[PDB]
Amino acid sequence: HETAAQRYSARLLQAGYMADYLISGGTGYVPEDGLTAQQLFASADGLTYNDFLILPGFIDFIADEVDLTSALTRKITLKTPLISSPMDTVTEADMAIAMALMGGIGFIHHNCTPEFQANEVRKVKKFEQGFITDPVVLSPSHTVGDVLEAKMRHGFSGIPITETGTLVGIVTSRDIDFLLLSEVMTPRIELVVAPAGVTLKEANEILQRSKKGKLPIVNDCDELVAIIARTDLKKNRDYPLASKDSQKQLLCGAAVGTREDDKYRLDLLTQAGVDVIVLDSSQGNSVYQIAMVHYIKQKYPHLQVIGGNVVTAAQAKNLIDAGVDGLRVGMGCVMACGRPQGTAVYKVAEYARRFGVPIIADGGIQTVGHVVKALALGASTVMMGSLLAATTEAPGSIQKFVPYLIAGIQHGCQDIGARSLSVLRSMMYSGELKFEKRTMSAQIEGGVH
Protein backbone atom coordinates (compact mmCIF):
# COMPACT_ATOMS: atom_id res chain seq x y z
CA HIS A 1 0.00 0.00 0.00
CA GLU A 2 1.76 3.21 -1.24
CA THR A 3 0.83 6.81 -0.17
CA ALA A 4 0.34 9.43 -2.98
CA ALA A 5 3.66 11.07 -1.89
CA GLN A 6 5.39 7.63 -2.12
CA ARG A 7 3.76 7.06 -5.59
CA TYR A 8 4.73 10.49 -6.99
CA SER A 9 8.32 10.44 -5.60
CA ALA A 10 8.89 6.83 -6.80
CA ARG A 11 7.35 7.40 -10.28
CA LEU A 12 9.26 10.71 -10.64
CA LEU A 13 12.48 8.70 -9.94
CA GLN A 14 11.31 6.17 -12.63
CA ALA A 15 11.13 9.18 -15.05
CA GLY A 16 14.47 10.54 -13.61
CA TYR A 17 15.70 14.09 -12.81
CA MET A 18 19.61 12.85 -1.83
CA ALA A 19 18.81 13.70 1.84
CA ASP A 20 15.07 14.12 1.06
CA TYR A 21 14.02 10.46 1.47
CA LEU A 22 16.44 10.33 4.47
CA ILE A 23 14.87 13.30 6.29
CA SER A 24 11.12 12.50 5.80
CA GLY A 25 10.86 8.95 4.30
CA GLY A 26 8.68 8.33 1.20
CA THR A 27 6.33 11.00 2.70
CA GLY A 28 7.90 13.90 0.71
CA TYR A 29 5.17 16.38 1.95
CA VAL A 30 1.66 17.15 0.62
CA PRO A 31 -0.55 20.11 1.71
CA GLU A 32 -3.32 19.33 4.21
CA ASP A 33 -6.57 20.36 2.46
CA GLY A 34 -10.17 19.33 3.35
CA LEU A 35 -11.36 17.04 6.20
CA THR A 36 -10.49 13.40 7.02
CA ALA A 37 -13.65 11.20 7.35
CA GLN A 38 -13.19 10.99 11.15
CA GLN A 39 -13.48 14.83 11.25
CA LEU A 40 -16.35 15.05 8.69
CA PHE A 41 -18.68 13.01 10.96
CA ALA A 42 -17.47 14.72 14.21
CA SER A 43 -19.98 17.66 14.08
CA ALA A 44 -22.90 15.20 14.62
CA ASP A 45 -25.12 16.40 11.74
CA GLY A 46 -27.02 13.90 9.56
CA LEU A 47 -24.77 14.03 6.52
CA THR A 48 -26.52 12.14 3.73
CA TYR A 49 -25.00 11.35 0.34
CA ASN A 50 -25.75 14.66 -1.40
CA ASP A 51 -23.95 16.53 1.40
CA PHE A 52 -20.20 15.71 0.97
CA LEU A 53 -17.61 15.37 -1.83
CA ILE A 54 -14.31 13.49 -2.18
CA LEU A 55 -11.43 15.78 -3.08
CA PRO A 56 -9.55 14.38 -6.15
CA GLY A 57 -6.14 12.66 -5.75
CA PHE A 58 -3.12 11.74 -7.92
CA ILE A 59 -3.85 9.42 -10.91
CA ASP A 60 -1.23 6.88 -12.06
CA PHE A 61 -3.37 4.07 -13.60
CA ILE A 62 -6.08 3.67 -16.31
CA ALA A 63 -9.83 3.45 -15.49
CA ASP A 64 -9.80 -0.26 -16.35
CA GLU A 65 -7.35 -1.41 -13.68
CA VAL A 66 -9.59 -0.45 -10.76
CA ASP A 67 -10.01 -3.85 -9.15
CA LEU A 68 -13.55 -4.02 -7.81
CA THR A 69 -13.24 -7.18 -5.71
CA SER A 70 -15.43 -6.77 -2.64
CA ALA A 71 -16.38 -8.99 0.28
CA LEU A 72 -20.03 -9.90 0.87
CA THR A 73 -19.62 -11.80 4.14
CA ARG A 74 -16.78 -13.24 6.15
CA LYS A 75 -16.31 -16.06 3.62
CA ILE A 76 -18.23 -15.16 0.39
CA THR A 77 -16.25 -12.79 -1.95
CA LEU A 78 -17.61 -11.09 -5.12
CA LYS A 79 -16.01 -9.64 -8.31
CA THR A 80 -18.48 -6.67 -8.29
CA PRO A 81 -19.56 -4.45 -5.29
CA LEU A 82 -23.20 -4.56 -6.39
CA ILE A 83 -26.21 -6.64 -5.17
CA SER A 84 -29.93 -6.86 -6.13
CA SER A 85 -32.27 -6.12 -3.19
CA PRO A 86 -34.64 -8.86 -1.87
CA MET A 87 -37.86 -7.18 -3.15
CA ASP A 88 -40.71 -8.68 -5.23
CA THR A 89 -40.36 -5.56 -7.46
CA VAL A 90 -36.63 -6.44 -8.04
CA THR A 91 -35.21 -9.95 -7.48
CA GLU A 92 -36.51 -13.34 -8.63
CA ALA A 93 -34.57 -16.35 -10.09
CA ASP A 94 -33.94 -14.60 -13.45
CA MET A 95 -32.38 -11.45 -11.90
CA ALA A 96 -30.55 -13.64 -9.33
CA ILE A 97 -28.86 -15.47 -12.27
CA ALA A 98 -28.20 -12.16 -14.08
CA MET A 99 -26.47 -10.58 -11.04
CA ALA A 100 -24.29 -13.63 -10.42
CA LEU A 101 -23.21 -13.65 -14.11
CA MET A 102 -22.15 -9.97 -13.58
CA GLY A 103 -19.94 -10.88 -10.56
CA GLY A 104 -22.49 -9.75 -7.91
CA ILE A 105 -25.13 -11.73 -5.99
CA GLY A 106 -28.95 -11.54 -5.82
CA PHE A 107 -31.27 -12.31 -2.88
CA ILE A 108 -34.62 -14.02 -3.65
CA HIS A 109 -37.51 -12.11 -1.98
CA HIS A 110 -39.78 -13.85 0.58
CA ASN A 111 -43.26 -12.43 -0.27
CA CYS A 112 -44.35 -16.00 -1.22
CA THR A 113 -45.08 -19.57 0.02
CA PRO A 114 -41.84 -21.26 1.37
CA GLU A 115 -41.93 -23.92 -1.39
CA PHE A 116 -41.92 -21.25 -4.15
CA GLN A 117 -38.76 -19.63 -2.72
CA ALA A 118 -36.92 -22.99 -2.53
CA ASN A 119 -37.93 -23.68 -6.16
CA GLU A 120 -36.59 -20.24 -7.24
CA VAL A 121 -33.26 -20.97 -5.41
CA ARG A 122 -33.01 -24.44 -7.08
CA LYS A 123 -33.63 -22.71 -10.44
CA VAL A 124 -30.51 -20.50 -9.80
CA LYS A 125 -28.12 -23.17 -8.37
CA LYS A 126 -28.56 -25.36 -11.55
CA PHE A 127 -27.95 -22.71 -14.28
CA GLU A 128 -25.19 -24.24 -16.54
CA GLN A 129 -24.72 -21.17 -18.94
CA GLY A 130 -26.08 -22.76 -22.19
CA PHE A 131 -28.09 -25.90 -21.33
CA ILE A 132 -31.85 -25.26 -20.82
CA THR A 133 -32.80 -24.89 -17.11
CA ASP A 134 -35.81 -27.12 -16.23
CA PRO A 135 -36.65 -28.49 -19.74
CA VAL A 136 -40.27 -29.45 -20.54
CA VAL A 137 -40.42 -33.13 -21.64
CA LEU A 138 -43.59 -34.93 -22.89
CA SER A 139 -45.02 -38.47 -22.79
CA PRO A 140 -46.15 -40.36 -25.99
CA SER A 141 -49.41 -41.05 -24.04
CA HIS A 142 -50.39 -37.34 -24.49
CA THR A 143 -52.08 -36.12 -27.73
CA VAL A 144 -49.95 -33.62 -29.74
CA GLY A 145 -52.76 -30.97 -29.70
CA ASP A 146 -51.83 -30.63 -25.94
CA VAL A 147 -48.19 -30.03 -26.98
CA LEU A 148 -49.13 -27.61 -29.83
CA GLU A 149 -50.89 -25.37 -27.28
CA ALA A 150 -47.80 -25.21 -25.04
CA LYS A 151 -46.43 -22.88 -27.76
CA MET A 152 -49.40 -20.77 -26.61
CA ARG A 153 -48.52 -21.41 -22.93
CA HIS A 154 -44.71 -21.24 -22.68
CA GLY A 155 -43.96 -19.90 -26.18
CA PHE A 156 -41.20 -22.41 -27.14
CA SER A 157 -42.22 -25.48 -29.28
CA GLY A 158 -39.44 -28.12 -29.77
CA ILE A 159 -40.34 -30.62 -27.00
CA PRO A 160 -38.25 -33.81 -26.31
CA ILE A 161 -40.24 -37.02 -25.60
CA THR A 162 -39.82 -39.93 -23.10
CA GLU A 163 -41.88 -42.37 -20.91
CA THR A 164 -42.76 -39.58 -18.34
CA GLY A 165 -39.66 -37.50 -17.32
CA THR A 166 -35.90 -36.72 -17.58
CA LEU A 167 -36.47 -42.28 -24.30
CA VAL A 168 -37.84 -41.36 -27.78
CA GLY A 169 -37.06 -38.45 -30.19
CA ILE A 170 -38.42 -34.87 -30.40
CA VAL A 171 -41.62 -33.17 -31.56
CA THR A 172 -41.01 -29.66 -32.99
CA SER A 173 -43.03 -27.06 -34.93
CA ARG A 174 -42.18 -28.65 -38.33
CA ASP A 175 -43.71 -31.97 -37.11
CA ILE A 176 -47.01 -30.15 -36.27
CA ASP A 177 -47.48 -27.22 -38.73
CA PHE A 178 -49.28 -29.49 -41.27
CA LEU A 179 -52.07 -31.61 -39.67
CA LEU A 180 -54.92 -34.17 -32.47
CA LEU A 181 -52.98 -36.95 -34.33
CA SER A 182 -52.29 -39.02 -31.15
CA GLU A 183 -48.44 -38.91 -31.26
CA VAL A 184 -46.64 -40.33 -34.38
CA MET A 185 -43.30 -38.43 -34.92
CA THR A 186 -39.53 -39.03 -34.40
CA PRO A 187 -38.54 -42.31 -32.62
CA ARG A 188 -35.09 -42.66 -30.89
CA ILE A 189 -33.34 -41.87 -34.23
CA GLU A 190 -31.77 -38.37 -33.62
CA LEU A 191 -28.53 -37.32 -35.41
CA VAL A 192 -25.21 -36.59 -33.59
CA VAL A 193 -26.08 -35.59 -29.96
CA ALA A 194 -24.21 -35.42 -26.63
CA PRO A 195 -23.72 -39.08 -25.37
CA ALA A 196 -22.63 -38.11 -21.80
CA GLY A 197 -21.52 -34.91 -19.97
CA VAL A 198 -20.27 -32.41 -22.65
CA THR A 199 -18.73 -28.90 -23.03
CA LEU A 200 -20.37 -25.81 -24.63
CA LYS A 201 -17.56 -25.60 -27.31
CA GLU A 202 -18.21 -29.27 -28.23
CA ALA A 203 -21.96 -28.61 -28.43
CA ASN A 204 -21.21 -25.50 -30.59
CA GLU A 205 -19.18 -27.72 -33.01
CA ILE A 206 -21.80 -30.57 -32.95
CA LEU A 207 -24.70 -28.10 -33.62
CA GLN A 208 -22.63 -26.74 -36.57
CA ARG A 209 -22.40 -30.27 -38.16
CA SER A 210 -25.90 -31.45 -37.12
CA LYS A 211 -27.82 -28.30 -38.41
CA LYS A 212 -30.89 -29.31 -36.25
CA GLY A 213 -32.18 -26.89 -33.57
CA LYS A 214 -32.38 -29.07 -30.41
CA LEU A 215 -29.53 -31.19 -29.09
CA PRO A 216 -30.35 -33.75 -26.40
CA ILE A 217 -27.74 -34.59 -23.80
CA VAL A 218 -28.16 -38.27 -22.85
CA ASN A 219 -26.26 -40.39 -20.31
CA ASP A 220 -24.46 -43.78 -20.41
CA CYS A 221 -27.78 -45.26 -19.29
CA ASP A 222 -29.06 -43.85 -22.70
CA GLU A 223 -31.78 -41.50 -21.38
CA LEU A 224 -32.08 -37.65 -21.54
CA VAL A 225 -30.30 -35.71 -18.72
CA ALA A 226 -30.23 -32.15 -20.23
CA ILE A 227 -31.04 -30.35 -23.56
CA ILE A 228 -29.58 -27.48 -25.68
CA ALA A 229 -31.32 -25.12 -28.12
CA ARG A 230 -29.31 -23.63 -31.04
CA THR A 231 -30.82 -20.14 -30.51
CA ASP A 232 -28.99 -19.79 -27.14
CA LEU A 233 -25.57 -21.03 -28.41
CA LYS A 234 -25.83 -18.25 -31.08
CA LYS A 235 -25.65 -15.65 -28.21
CA ASN A 236 -24.33 -17.01 -24.86
CA ARG A 237 -21.58 -14.51 -23.82
CA ASP A 238 -18.29 -14.74 -21.91
CA TYR A 239 -18.73 -14.10 -18.15
CA PRO A 240 -15.24 -13.86 -16.50
CA LEU A 241 -16.81 -12.17 -13.41
CA ALA A 242 -18.28 -15.58 -12.62
CA SER A 243 -19.62 -15.45 -8.98
CA LYS A 244 -19.49 -19.29 -8.79
CA ASP A 245 -19.21 -21.36 -5.57
CA SER A 246 -16.62 -24.14 -4.80
CA GLN A 247 -18.80 -26.60 -6.85
CA LYS A 248 -18.51 -24.20 -9.89
CA GLN A 249 -22.23 -23.19 -9.93
CA LEU A 250 -23.80 -19.75 -9.31
CA LEU A 251 -23.91 -18.11 -5.86
CA CYS A 252 -27.35 -16.92 -4.69
CA GLY A 253 -28.98 -15.75 -1.45
CA ALA A 254 -32.46 -15.76 0.10
CA ALA A 255 -34.30 -13.40 2.42
CA VAL A 256 -36.04 -15.04 5.40
CA GLY A 257 -38.44 -13.60 7.96
CA THR A 258 -37.59 -13.72 11.70
CA ARG A 259 -40.95 -15.27 12.86
CA GLU A 260 -41.28 -18.55 14.77
CA ASP A 261 -42.81 -19.99 11.55
CA ASP A 262 -39.56 -19.47 9.62
CA LYS A 263 -37.35 -22.39 10.80
CA TYR A 264 -39.38 -24.32 8.17
CA ARG A 265 -38.71 -21.74 5.38
CA LEU A 266 -35.02 -21.84 6.35
CA ASP A 267 -34.98 -25.65 6.09
CA LEU A 268 -36.43 -25.68 2.53
CA LEU A 269 -33.94 -23.03 1.33
CA THR A 270 -30.95 -24.82 2.92
CA GLN A 271 -32.10 -28.12 1.26
CA ALA A 272 -32.09 -26.26 -2.10
CA GLY A 273 -28.43 -25.43 -1.16
CA VAL A 274 -28.69 -21.60 -0.81
CA ASP A 275 -25.32 -19.88 -0.12
CA VAL A 276 -26.32 -16.94 2.15
CA ILE A 277 -29.31 -15.72 4.19
CA VAL A 278 -30.40 -12.14 4.85
CA LEU A 279 -32.60 -11.73 7.91
CA ASP A 280 -35.19 -9.28 6.58
CA SER A 281 -36.25 -7.03 9.52
CA SER A 282 -37.00 -3.28 9.81
CA GLN A 283 -34.80 -3.17 12.95
CA GLY A 284 -32.37 -6.08 13.35
CA ASN A 285 -31.47 -5.67 17.05
CA SER A 286 -34.39 -7.60 18.61
CA VAL A 287 -34.39 -10.55 21.04
CA TYR A 288 -36.16 -12.88 18.58
CA GLN A 289 -33.91 -11.87 15.62
CA ILE A 290 -30.87 -12.70 17.85
CA ALA A 291 -32.61 -15.99 18.76
CA MET A 292 -33.02 -16.60 14.98
CA VAL A 293 -29.24 -15.96 14.49
CA HIS A 294 -28.23 -18.31 17.36
CA TYR A 295 -30.62 -20.91 15.93
CA ILE A 296 -29.11 -20.84 12.37
CA LYS A 297 -25.51 -21.00 13.67
CA GLN A 298 -26.48 -23.94 15.88
CA LYS A 299 -28.20 -25.98 13.18
CA TYR A 300 -26.54 -25.13 9.84
CA PRO A 301 -22.94 -24.16 10.63
CA HIS A 302 -22.10 -23.69 6.94
CA LEU A 303 -24.74 -21.09 6.03
CA GLN A 304 -23.62 -17.42 5.89
CA VAL A 305 -26.05 -15.00 7.69
CA ILE A 306 -26.46 -11.23 7.14
CA GLY A 307 -28.11 -9.36 10.06
CA GLY A 308 -31.27 -7.24 9.55
CA ASN A 309 -31.31 -3.45 9.16
CA VAL A 310 -29.18 -1.47 11.68
CA VAL A 311 -27.91 2.14 11.82
CA THR A 312 -25.88 2.32 15.08
CA ALA A 313 -22.73 0.84 16.57
CA ALA A 314 -24.87 -0.43 19.54
CA GLN A 315 -27.14 -2.49 17.22
CA ALA A 316 -24.11 -3.66 15.18
CA LYS A 317 -22.49 -4.86 18.47
CA ASN A 318 -25.46 -6.98 19.56
CA LEU A 319 -25.82 -8.65 16.14
CA ILE A 320 -22.07 -9.17 15.67
CA ASP A 321 -21.54 -10.75 19.11
CA ALA A 322 -24.59 -12.93 18.35
CA GLY A 323 -22.44 -14.32 15.47
CA VAL A 324 -23.76 -12.75 12.19
CA ASP A 325 -21.41 -12.45 9.21
CA GLY A 326 -22.67 -9.27 7.59
CA LEU A 327 -24.98 -6.35 8.06
CA ARG A 328 -27.52 -4.38 6.02
CA VAL A 329 -26.60 -0.86 7.10
CA GLY A 330 -29.69 1.10 6.25
CA MET A 331 -33.00 2.29 7.75
CA GLY A 332 -35.42 5.16 7.26
CA CYS A 333 -35.58 6.05 3.57
CA VAL A 334 -43.37 9.24 8.99
CA MET A 335 -41.53 6.82 11.28
CA ALA A 336 -39.76 8.77 14.10
CA CYS A 337 -36.62 6.59 14.01
CA GLY A 338 -33.80 6.00 11.60
CA ARG A 339 -30.58 7.79 10.71
CA PRO A 340 -29.25 9.85 7.79
CA GLN A 341 -27.79 7.29 5.43
CA GLY A 342 -24.22 8.65 5.02
CA THR A 343 -23.64 8.83 8.78
CA ALA A 344 -25.14 5.34 9.28
CA VAL A 345 -22.88 3.74 6.72
CA TYR A 346 -19.75 5.44 8.09
CA LYS A 347 -20.54 4.69 11.77
CA VAL A 348 -21.55 1.03 11.28
CA ALA A 349 -18.74 0.28 8.87
CA GLU A 350 -16.18 1.83 11.16
CA TYR A 351 -17.52 -0.23 14.08
CA ALA A 352 -17.94 -3.59 12.32
CA ARG A 353 -14.51 -3.26 10.74
CA ARG A 354 -13.01 -3.87 14.23
CA PHE A 355 -13.94 -7.57 13.86
CA GLY A 356 -13.92 -7.97 10.09
CA VAL A 357 -17.64 -8.10 9.41
CA PRO A 358 -18.24 -6.25 6.14
CA ILE A 359 -21.50 -4.37 5.77
CA ILE A 360 -23.94 -3.69 2.94
CA ALA A 361 -25.07 -0.14 2.24
CA ASP A 362 -28.77 -0.53 1.48
CA GLY A 363 -31.03 2.47 1.10
CA GLY A 364 -31.44 5.66 -0.88
CA ILE A 365 -28.78 5.10 -3.55
CA GLN A 366 -29.91 6.59 -6.89
CA THR A 367 -26.75 7.67 -8.84
CA VAL A 368 -23.30 6.18 -9.50
CA GLY A 369 -21.89 9.05 -7.47
CA HIS A 370 -23.83 7.83 -4.42
CA VAL A 371 -22.43 4.38 -5.10
CA VAL A 372 -18.85 5.61 -5.23
CA LYS A 373 -19.47 7.49 -2.01
CA ALA A 374 -21.11 4.66 -0.10
CA LEU A 375 -18.04 2.68 -1.08
CA ALA A 376 -15.63 5.39 0.06
CA LEU A 377 -17.38 5.70 3.45
CA GLY A 378 -16.90 2.03 4.34
CA ALA A 379 -19.64 0.00 2.73
CA SER A 380 -18.30 -3.20 1.23
CA THR A 381 -21.20 -3.66 -1.19
CA VAL A 382 -24.14 -1.55 -2.33
CA MET A 383 -27.61 -3.10 -2.64
CA MET A 384 -29.39 -1.69 -5.71
CA GLY A 385 -33.07 -0.99 -4.87
CA SER A 386 -35.97 -0.03 -7.18
CA LEU A 387 -33.20 1.41 -9.44
CA LEU A 388 -33.39 -2.08 -11.09
CA ALA A 389 -37.23 -2.30 -11.12
CA ALA A 390 -38.79 -1.83 -14.62
CA THR A 391 -35.63 -3.26 -16.26
CA THR A 392 -36.78 -6.16 -18.51
CA GLU A 393 -35.54 -8.82 -15.99
CA ALA A 394 -37.57 -7.19 -13.15
CA PRO A 395 -40.80 -9.17 -12.25
CA GLY A 396 -32.93 -1.56 -20.17
CA SER A 397 -31.56 -5.04 -19.29
CA ILE A 398 -29.45 -5.97 -16.21
CA GLN A 399 -26.84 -7.84 -18.34
CA LYS A 400 -26.27 -4.68 -20.52
CA PHE A 401 -26.80 -2.17 -17.63
CA VAL A 402 -24.43 -3.48 -14.89
CA PRO A 403 -21.34 -2.70 -17.12
CA TYR A 404 -22.38 0.93 -17.13
CA LEU A 405 -22.29 1.08 -13.33
CA ILE A 406 -19.00 -0.85 -13.30
CA ALA A 407 -17.36 1.64 -15.71
CA GLY A 408 -18.77 4.52 -13.66
CA ILE A 409 -17.39 3.21 -10.38
CA GLN A 410 -14.07 2.59 -12.09
CA HIS A 411 -13.90 6.13 -13.44
CA GLY A 412 -14.72 7.43 -9.99
CA CYS A 413 -12.17 5.40 -8.07
CA GLN A 414 -9.68 6.54 -10.76
CA ASP A 415 -10.35 10.31 -10.18
CA ILE A 416 -9.88 9.64 -6.43
CA GLY A 417 -6.53 7.92 -7.29
CA ALA A 418 -7.35 4.62 -5.51
CA ARG A 419 -6.46 1.60 -7.68
CA SER A 420 -8.79 -0.91 -5.92
CA LEU A 421 -11.77 -0.56 -3.60
CA SER A 422 -9.77 -2.27 -0.78
CA VAL A 423 -7.15 0.51 -1.19
CA LEU A 424 -10.01 3.11 -1.39
CA ARG A 425 -11.13 2.10 2.08
CA SER A 426 -7.55 1.79 3.41
CA MET A 427 -6.90 5.31 2.06
CA MET A 428 -10.07 6.50 3.88
CA TYR A 429 -9.47 4.90 7.34
CA SER A 430 -5.78 6.03 7.36
CA GLY A 431 -6.89 9.68 6.74
CA GLU A 432 -5.08 9.96 3.36
CA LEU A 433 -8.41 10.50 1.52
CA LYS A 434 -9.95 13.98 2.10
CA PHE A 435 -13.59 15.14 2.07
CA GLU A 436 -15.49 18.46 1.91
CA LYS A 437 -19.01 19.38 3.17
CA ARG A 438 -21.54 21.35 1.05
CA THR A 439 -23.90 24.23 1.89
CA MET A 440 -27.31 23.91 0.10
CA SER A 441 -26.12 26.78 -2.16
CA ALA A 442 -23.26 24.51 -3.41
CA GLN A 443 -25.43 21.48 -4.37
CA ILE A 444 -28.30 23.49 -5.95
CA GLU A 445 -25.34 24.67 -8.13
CA GLY A 446 -23.83 21.79 -10.18
CA GLY A 447 -26.36 19.04 -9.20
CA VAL A 448 -29.42 17.84 -7.17
CA HIS A 449 -32.33 20.12 -8.33
- Residue of the chain from 81, 86, 103, 160 that contacts ligand ATP (CB under 6 A): 160
Query: By CB under 8 A, what part of segment 364-393 binds its own copies?
Result: 364, 367-373, 376
Using CA atoms, how far apart are residues 352 and 314, in angstroms rounded to an integer? 10
Q: Would you say 230 or 437 has its CB closer to ligand ATP?
A: 230
> Residues 186, 159: contact at Cβ < 8 Å?
no
Shortest separation between residue 355's beta carbon and its own copies, angstroms: 13
Distance CA 417, CA 59 (A): 5
Contact 293, 307 (CB under 8 A): yes
- Residue 286 sits in the site that holds its own copies (CB under 8 A): yes
Rounded Cα distance, 108 and 150, in Å:
28
For residue 203, the minimal CB distance to its own copies (Å) is: 44
Q: Contact, 380 vs 346, CB < 8 A?
A: no
Q: Does the annotation place 282 within a ligand binding site? A: yes
Are 345 and 313 in contact by the 8 Å Cβ rule? The answer is: no
- Cβ–Cβ under 8 Å, residues 284 and 359: no
Q: Has 57 been labeled as part of a binding site?
A: no
Instruction: Please answer whether residues 266 and 296 qualify as being in contact, where contact means their C-beta atoms are separated by less than 8 angstroms.
Output: yes
- Using CB under 6 A as the binding rule, whether residue 159 contacts ligand ATP is answered as yes
Stretch that binds ligand ATP, among 188-196, 306-314, 329-337, 432-440 (CB under 6 A): 188-196
* Of the candidate residues 6, 36, 69, 157, the single one contacting ligand ATP (CB under 6 A): 157
Q: For ligand ATP, which stretch binds (CB under 6 A), given 19-27, 166-174, 264-272, 385-393? A: 166-174
Find out whether 86 and 255 touch, Cβ atoms under 8 Å.
yes
Kindly list the distances between the CA atom of residue 76 and the CA atoms of 69, 103, 251, in Å, as whole numbers in the listed order: 11, 12, 9
Q: Alpha helix (H) ranges present in 149-217?
A: 150-153, 200-210
Report chain breaks in the chain, C–N > 2.5 Å, as residues after which they occur. Answer: 17, 166, 179, 333, 395
**Residue 282, contacted partner among its own copies, ligand ATP, none, CB below 5-8 A by kind:** its own copies
Of the candidates 73, 318, 380, 381, which one interacts with its own copies according to CB under 8 A? 318
99 binds, among its own copies, ligand ATP, none (CB under 5 to 8 A by kind): none
The amino acid at 444: I
Q: Which of 164, 282, 397, 430 binds its own copies (CB under 8 A)?
A: 282
In the region spanning residues 320 to 339, those forming contacts with its own copies, defined by CB under 8 A, are: 331-339
User: Could you tell me how far CA 94 lies from the centroid of its own chain?
Assistant: 12
Does 57 help bind ligand ATP (rule: CB under 6 A)? no
Of residues 130-149, which lie at the interface with ligand ATP (CB under 6 A)?
Answer: 132, 135-136
What part of residues 390-429 is at the interface with its own copies (CB under 8 A)? 412, 415-416
Give the shortest CB-167-to-ligand ATP separation in angstroms.
10
Residue 170 binds ligand ATP (CB under 6 A):
yes
- 193 vs 372 by CB, closer to its own copies: 372
Site string for ligand ATP, 214-253 (x = CB under 6 A): xx-----------x-xxxx---------------------
Residue 253 marked as a ligand binder: no
d(CA 420, CA 67): 5
Q: Which does 179 bind (CB under 5 to 8 A by kind): ligand ATP, its own copies, none?
A: none
- Directed axis angle between helix 93-101 and helix 114-125, to 10°? 30
| Contact by Cβ (8 Å): 139, 161 | yes
Residue 191 in contact with ligand ATP, rule: CB under 6 A: yes
Nearer to ligand ATP, 135 or 358 (CB): 135
Write the DSSP symbol of residue 274: -
Among 137, 257, 340, 399, binds its own copies (CB under 8 A): 340
> Which residue of the chain is nearest ligand ATP when measured via CB?
213
Could you tell me if 164 and 139 are in contact, meaning their C-beta atoms sit under 8 angstroms apart?
Answer: yes
Count CB neighbours of 120 within 10 A.
21
| Residues making up the binding site | 280-282, 330-332, 362-364, 385-386, 445-447
| Residues making up the binding site for K(+) | 332, 445-447
| Residues making up the binding site for NAD(+) | 280-282, 330-332
